[PDB]
């Protein structure tokens, strides 16, 4: 009766996180297709260049009692950072979530920006700033890669630590758009919105992972 | 003619989906009245209300913080911002993210040790 209650409370939160995940897809997928249309002057985000410094948007939870959700992700990220720094490539970190902020303040790491305390209610608006710092550094030649580090949600018992490349970006219609003002300006904005979107999706998925992990820890 | 499918969505949610006779929205270069058959178009819109004349004449208004309007054969999609976007506003948000991190390289060996320890403690919890 108490474990059943425990499960009802968790299921209610999980359904909320699952709805957020699902509600976030249309915007990202439509954007990706429009970008495809326009990408087909090459925008910096669409081409590889010599890699001198790399950037990571890291998603950690704000709360404990989630088993090794953060631990396993941090482990995977440190392994990758070292292979870069071993080669003389500097790493900048944009930290999302309290646990991540405390872990890196402790072990060192260049945290150039952060946002914590979103909990069960993350939002795009709270991610604009953190993301902006990294996009600008890329625009300025200060980053040559930008990755998202987070947990992919599978099911209430399976989550996968993941590092994906956001920058640079990873048959055709017979018609073309009338572009107001022009395609260049538009493409630049869509690419920024798309990356922001992917970071948001990474965050909500991590949260879905967190809640699942916590119910398991609550056991 | 008569109607086309409209989707209004933000990065966070699905705001509207359904057949409409037309929409009215303020574009970056001017007012826009999109009817069925309008040619393909891609433009930013300004913060403000979007007026939607749904199928069967029913009018509906939705306030948008701004975003992108995409018109293609058949479907029209408003990709709305969840907050008013702009260089200064975005930058203001970036400053805060930076200041928060500046309020307070990388010892890989210590990091591993700390994680190994944390893992150990979980194992104890597991074994109760």
UniProtKB/Swiss-Prot annotation, chain A:
<keyword id="KW-0139">CF(1)</keyword>
<dbReference type="GO" id="GO:0005886">
    <property type="term" value="C:plasma membrane"/>
</dbReference>
<keyword id="KW-0375">Hydrogen ion transport</keyword>
<keyword id="KW-0066">ATP synthesis</keyword>
<dbReference type="GO" id="GO:0046961">
    <property type="term" value="F:proton-transporting ATPase activity, rotational mechanism"/>
</dbReference>
<dbReference type="GO" id="GO:0045259">
    <property type="term" value="C:proton-transporting ATP synthase complex"/>
</dbReference>
<comment type="subunit">
    <text>F-type ATPases have 2 components, CF(1) - the catalytic core - and CF(0) - the membrane proton channel. CF(1) has five subunits: alpha(3), beta(3), gamma(1), delta(1), epsilon(1). CF(0) has three main subunits: a, b and c.</text>
</comment>
<dbReference type="GO" id="GO:0015986">
    <property type="term" value="P:proton motive force-driven ATP synthesis"/>
</dbReference>
<keyword id="KW-0406">Ion transport</keyword>
<keyword id="KW-0997">Cell inner membrane</keyword>
<comment type="similarity">
    <text>Belongs to the ATPase gamma chain family.</text>
</comment>
<comment type="function">
    <text>Produces ATP from ADP in the presence of a proton gradient across the membrane. The gamma chain is believed to be important in regulating ATPase activity and the flow of protons through the CF(0) complex.</text>
</comment>
<dbReference type="GO" id="GO:0016020">
    <property type="term" value="C:membrane"/>
</dbReference>
<keyword id="KW-0813">Transport</keyword>
<dbReference type="GO" id="GO:0046933">
    <property type="term" value="F:proton-transporting ATP synthase activity, rotational mechanism"/>
</dbReference>
<dbReference type="GO" id="GO:0005524">
    <property type="term" value="F:ATP binding"/>
</dbReference>
<keyword id="KW-1003">Cell membrane</keyword>
<protein>
    <recommendedName>
        <fullName>ATP synthase gamma chain</fullName>
    </recommendedName>
</protein>
<dbReference type="GO" id="GO:0042777">
    <property type="term" value="P:proton motive force-driven plasma membrane ATP synthesis"/>
</dbReference>
<keyword id="KW-0472">Membrane</keyword>
From Swiss-Prot, chain B:
<comment type="similarity">
    <text>Belongs to the ATPase epsilon chain family.</text>
</comment>
<dbReference type="InterPro" id="IPR020546">
    <property type="entry name" value="ATP_synth_F1_dsu/esu_N"/>
</dbReference>
<dbReference type="InterPro" id="IPR001469">
    <property type="entry name" value="ATP_synth_F1_dsu/esu"/>
</dbReference>
<dbReference type="GO" id="GO:0005886">
    <property type="term" value="C:plasma membrane"/>
</dbReference>
<keyword id="KW-0472">Membrane</keyword>
<dbReference type="InterPro" id="IPR036771">
    <property type="entry name" value="ATPsynth_dsu/esu_N"/>
</dbReference>
<dbReference type="GO" id="GO:0015986">
    <property type="term" value="P:proton motive force-driven ATP synthesis"/>
</dbReference>
<comment type="function">
    <text>Produces ATP from ADP in the presence of a proton gradient across the membrane.</text>
</comment>
<dbReference type="GO" id="GO:0005524">
    <property type="term" value="F:ATP binding"/>
</dbReference>
<keyword id="KW-0375">Hydrogen ion transport</keyword>
<keyword id="KW-0139">CF(1)</keyword>
<dbReference type="GO" id="GO:0045259">
    <property type="term" value="C:proton-transporting ATP synthase complex"/>
</dbReference>
<dbReference type="InterPro" id="IPR036794">
    <property type="entry name" value="ATP_F1_dsu/esu_C_sf"/>
</dbReference>
<keyword id="KW-1003">Cell membrane</keyword>
<dbReference type="GO" id="GO:0046933">
    <property type="term" value="F:proton-transporting ATP synthase activity, rotational mechanism"/>
</dbReference>
<dbReference type="Pfam" id="PF00401">
    <property type="entry name" value="ATP-synt_DE"/>
</dbReference>
<keyword id="KW-0997">Cell inner membrane</keyword>
<keyword id="KW-0066">ATP synthesis</keyword>
<protein>
    <recommendedName>
        <fullName>ATP synthase epsilon chain</fullName>
    </recommendedName>
</protein>
<keyword id="KW-0813">Transport</keyword>
<dbReference type="GO" id="GO:0042777">
    <property type="term" value="P:proton motive force-driven plasma membrane ATP synthesis"/>
</dbReference>
<keyword id="KW-0406">Ion transport</keyword>
